[PDB]
């Protein structure tokens, strides 16, 4: 199926992984009950800026888009709008190597935002040939733009998976790169009792002494992270692109969701906790399992176990009713298991990632 669904249950020790403009924990009302929230942007930044991301995605083999490979295709997709000479000029200004010189490796498909940007460049060099400013004169005024696209042509997977970088030299409407993974707001499965740390600041030269007072809200809790991956869009933005590679990226996303945590007040509260549960399932449509905790989970022996239980019990009755189909696998650290099979039980996270990498086949 086209969509990959990632569901994570992770418990956090007393901390404050996300603040508002008034130094208070971000929250969200769910089921009429207040839940502590970790914004999706915080999670997605925590992933995108992580070292694992930089290793497996920042330095992927498919990060570099060679324009010389896209010679023919760009000529037939923009042949309706521009002349061939203009296109060749643009590629010669961007690469910047003129010769053709067929690489003996001419691509079949092209990434959309690429044709979107180089089309803009074609327009610019067209009106530049009409004015007419010579190649050097115009290359002087297009320096920032040319460099701007040159750095983007070396970060294919990053843009394809996370989107453009909030300050990429993109202009055209096609330059607005979304996806390919969608990260949801992480909310607590339960109603949270927020604590207020009441601290002071000791002056070593007047320890008598007038104390510098302060407060800071913190709370522990079991969070439910959800994310999804659009494989078709990931293949299109790397176009490319074989499905297996997209799966290989999806594994990285799974791992990052299972491990990465925002760095807010981690120097003083240190909530470096790993995910206690993570399930992956393929589907024709993305679905969050948030309504499993629509009715606020109440603690029997902690919040974690009844959260796992609530999740599984929800998946049992709800899964088949909705269009979930198959296939699904779950990696957890504690029984019970969902009574329903067709959800393979994985002992380790690496086995789960390997399961994802093989398109969910056993």
């Amino acid at each position: 199926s086209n969509f990959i669904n990632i569901h994570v249950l992770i418990s956090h020790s007393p901390s404050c992984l996300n603040r508002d403009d008034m130094n208070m924990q971000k929250d969200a009302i769910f089921g009429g009950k207040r839940r502590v929230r970790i914004s999706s942007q915080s999670l997605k930044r925590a992933m995108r800026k992580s070292g694992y991301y930089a290793q497996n995605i920042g330095e992927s083999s498919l990060r570099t888009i060679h324009l010389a490979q896209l010679r023919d295709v760009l000529r037939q997709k923009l042949g309706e709008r521009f002349d061939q000479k203009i296109i060749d000029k643009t590629l010669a200004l961007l690469s910047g190597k003129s010769v053709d010189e067929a690489e003996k490796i001419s691509a079949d498909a092209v990434t959309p935002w690429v044709v979107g940007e180089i089309a803009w460049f074609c327009e610019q060099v067209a009106k530049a040939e009409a004015d007419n400013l010579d190649d050097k004169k115009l290359l002087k005024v297009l320096k920032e733009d040319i460099a701007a696209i040159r750095v983007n042509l070396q970060q294919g997977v990053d843009i394809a998976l996370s989107g453009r970088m909030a300050t990429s030299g993109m202009m055209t409407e096609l330059g607005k790169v979304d996806g390919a993974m969608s990260i949801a707001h992480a909310i607590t499965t339960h109603q949270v009792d927020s604590d207020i740390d009441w601290f002071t600041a000791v002056d070593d030269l007047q320890e008598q002494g007038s104390a510098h007072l302060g407060t800071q809200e913190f709370s522990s809790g079991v969070f439910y992270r959800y994310a999804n991956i659009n494989l078709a869009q990931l293949q299109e933005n790397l176009g490319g692109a074989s499905r297996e590679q997209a799966l290989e990226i999806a594994t990285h996303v799974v791992h990052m969701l299972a491990t990465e945590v925002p760095g807010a007040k981690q120097r003083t509260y240190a909530a470096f906790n790993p995910a206690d549960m993570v399930m992956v399932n393929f589907s024709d449509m993305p679905l969050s399992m948030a309504n499993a905790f629509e009715k606020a989970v109440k603690a029997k022996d902690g919040f974690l176990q009844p959260s796992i239980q609530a999740f599984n019990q929800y998946w049992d009755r709800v899964a088949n009713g909705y269009g979930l189909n198959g296939a699904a696998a779950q990696f957890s650290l504690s029984d019970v298991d969902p009574i329903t099979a067709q959800v393979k039980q994985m002992p380790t996270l690496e086995q789960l990632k390997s399961w994802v990498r093989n398109n969910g086949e056993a």
Binding site: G32, G179, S182, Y226, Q233, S288, N291
Partner: protein, 219 residues
């Protein structure tokens, strides 16, 4: 006897646009036409560049939205708003260069706990059939959200298909009855309008034009 496609929008958080050129980005109590059109557009795989498919989709279909109040443990849970303090590091100073600010701030209102049942039908000047829309919302090509990518679904889009004369009569067949309805088709004995600037000016990105809902109130 029109054919209706019935969808459900059921995320834990939702966001539906309102007129804004600032950082504060508000929402309404129910989905907007631009929102639903962007939704179906996403499902169908319509890119942002081709004005053609956008125009065709917009002219082709019409909507009716019912607000489903939540009931759990025979208790009513009314809708509520959120104000997310949402910052950006390294945001764009200019549209062309690679120069950036250290930090910019935006405020984004969300909608919890909201659920909606939406019935859509074909216009007479239709360029497609309801079957294509069904097949599209059952197996989308782009990720569907409501209406920010941060907000996922907890119930499948497709709820059902029906035959009916009125959109109200079409909505009555499905379980959460008694909610207010905002449609683009008028029903007898119902008067009130509701003004909103949510019809996307497709020829000119990215701005919107004024339109009005027909309001139906049940119990």
């Amino acid at each position: 006897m029109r054919s209706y496609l019935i969808l459900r929008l059921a995320g834990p958080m939702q966001a539906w646009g309102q007129p804004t050129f600032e950082g504060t980005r508000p929402t309404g109590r129910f989905p907007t036409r631009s929102g639903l059109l962007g939704l179906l557009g996403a499902c169908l795989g319509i890119q942002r560049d081709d004005t053609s498919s956008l125009q065709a989709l917009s002219e082709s279909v019409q909507f009716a939205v019912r607000c489903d109040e939540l009931i759990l443990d025979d208790r009513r849970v009314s809708v509520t708003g959120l104000r997310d303090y949402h910052t950006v590091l390294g945001a764009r100073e200019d549209y062309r260069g690679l120069k950036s600010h250290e930090t910019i701030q935006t405020w984004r209102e969300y909608l919890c706990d909201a659920s909606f049942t939406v019935a859509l039908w074909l216009t007479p000047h239709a360029t497609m059939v309801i079957s294509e829309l069904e097949k599209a919302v059952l197996k989308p090509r782009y990720t569907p959200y409501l209406g920010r990518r941060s907000c996922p679904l907890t119930h499948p889009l497709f709820l059902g298909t029906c035959q009916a004369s009125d959109p109200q009569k079409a909505l009555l067949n499905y379980e959460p009855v008694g909610g207010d309805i905002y449609s683009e088709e008028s029903v007898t004995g119902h008067h009130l309008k509701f003004t909103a600037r949510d019809e996307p000016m497709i020829t000119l990105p990215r701005q919107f034009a004024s339109r009005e809902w027909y309001v139906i109130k049940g119990g």
